[PDB]
Design a protein around this ligand. Structure first.
Ligand SMILES: NS(=O)(=O)c1cc2c(cc1C(F)(F)F)NCNS2(=O)=O
Ligand SMILES: NS(=O)(=O)c1cc2c(cc1C(F)(F)F)NCNS2(=O)=O
Ligand SMILES: N[C@@H](CCC(=O)O)C(=O)O
Ligand SMILES: N[C@@H](CCC(=O)O)C(=O)O
Ligand SMILES: [Zn+2]
Ligand SMILES: [Zn+2]
Lengths: 258, 258
């Protein structure tokens, strides 16, 4: 049986090839997670089909309906066999899906327009002239929503009631807001995405400060699935052989435009 | 039933208190892993006894008999219920024991005596005046034994046949060897330990270069043990609540001497 792989259009994990229109199936896409999916499938010995998550989200549980959206939803409701994406390992997710050991490290970080008078979270929290927000329906939003650290609770208290909304529906949208806001909008996003954008034209953004936390992305499967074991062993093998490091260099730095 | 916890004396994860010989049971010890064990046991609701691993090793498989030693061996052969220690998650171990998601990140790194003319692993591999080695029966030695990377493979070739031996039986031994060899010995060890030592008197060593790889420590349990599920969830909870970052600050940096 062909394994259905849910993923998400997010640079440089999964992007449309410049000629995707004249290609078919898996060949339409390129990126870090496309390269990783191929290796995983090869070492686990399965055929697969890449599919982009329909609502374009990572996955959160609606407080009202209790329904999971995003890639997590696709796994929970049986629409996909595996997720290969920059999907953060979290407790609430681990409760309904299985994750491999992490294939990539990251932390919440701050993206500013170059020259913006900000050095850290504490700095953002102490002021009001510069707006700031996070992706919607992602692990970053939940981190702020749940935090008990004073600086972070204060940041959440501002963000949840700021108007107009400080939250964006896509990473691309957050970056665009930073670029067009003349230094008046800072964007809280994962260090991996932050680092990738830092190396792309127009070269007008930068990551500042340390990471606010430390965690990892994992390959996700439906709870109890028979795939989980093999996939986890494959990720460990690829980690030790240095493939993950090679892939990061290929898609983040070898490509650098700044 | 009281959970038997295997662990290892390795600063600052598990250390003997100065109060010591006059204390009993778990009270005799302090450190990051002593504190971790306490929070894990609280969240999973078990009582536990800390026991130092008999042979003082992390764990590797004798290539001849295929018998496991160290903390890995204690789990594999039913002598301990759980290992709470700076135990590296690796492919060969995952085949015989279960690991939680990582509670701490690290990479292999180089420790030198201050002033030693060495900037990197490449530097080390290009010369012979400075000897270098790793801990026995650990994941670092295995990393080099298995590595296909040109620098590391060449390093292994030198290490595996150098005389007198460049390998050491404990981390303490590795560090003291560096400190007393007048710059003629470099020690390859995990960045967490290296960074800890760099901040302790006599303040004569230094971590140089980036990490050679990226990985993590996990809490380990016997294959299929029922404890594993609860333990893993406890670690994710502790991660998200910030307790892990708190612990590291307490034991690495709050304690700094240099
Ligand atoms: N340092 S980490 O927590 O992000 C990590 C952990 C493990 C990996 C790989 C990574 C990293 F590449 F993301 F850096 N490999 C498999 N075993 S692991 O210890 O969980
Ligand atoms: N970056 S990491 O690979 O070492 C890591 C991963 C996860 C953690 C914590 C860490 C770190 F603190 F060691 F940094 N928390 C639980 N989930 S995780 O993604 O596996
Ligand atoms: N990687 C995150 C999405 C990005 C973010 O929340 O900043 C997740 O899995 O939800
Ligand atoms: N953390 C290592 C021990 C120290 C080392 O190998 O450098 C292990 O679990 O084997
Ligand atoms: Zn708690
Ligand atoms: Zn033997």
């Amino acid at each position: 049986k062909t394994v259905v792989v849910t993923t998400i259009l997010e640079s440089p994990y999964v992007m449309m090839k410049k000629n995707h229109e004249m290609l078919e199936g898996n060949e339409r896409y390129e990126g870090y997670c496309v390269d990783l999916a191929a290796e995983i499938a090869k070492h686990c010995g399965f055929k697969y089909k890449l599919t982009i998550v329909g609502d374009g989200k990572y996955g959160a549980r609606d407080a009202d309906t209790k329904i999971w959206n995003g890639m997590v939803g696709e796994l929970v409701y049986g629409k996909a066999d595996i997720a290969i994406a920059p999907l953060t390992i979290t407790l609430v997710r681990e409760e309904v899906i299985d994750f491999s050991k992490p294939f990539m490290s990251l932390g919440i970080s701050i993206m500013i327009k170059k020259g913006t008078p900000i050095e850290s979270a504490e700095d953002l929290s102490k002021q009001t002239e510069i707006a700031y927000g996070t992706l919607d329906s992602g692990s970053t939003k939940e981190f702020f929503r749940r935090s008990k650290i004073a600086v972070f609770d204060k940041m959440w208290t501002y963000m949840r009631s700021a108007e107009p909304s400080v939250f964006v529906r896509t990473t691309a949208e957050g970056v665009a807001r930073v670029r067009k806001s003349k230094g008046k909008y800072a964007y809280l996003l994962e260090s991996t995405m932050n680092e990738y954008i830092e190396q792309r034209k127009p070269c007008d953004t930068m990551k500042v400060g340390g990471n606010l936390d430390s965690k990892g992305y994992g390959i996700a499967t439906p709870k109890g699935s028979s795939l989980g074991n093999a996939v986890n062993l494959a990720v460990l093998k690829l980690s030790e052989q240095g493939l993950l490091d090679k892939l990061k260099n290929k898609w983040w730095y070898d490509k650098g435009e700044c």
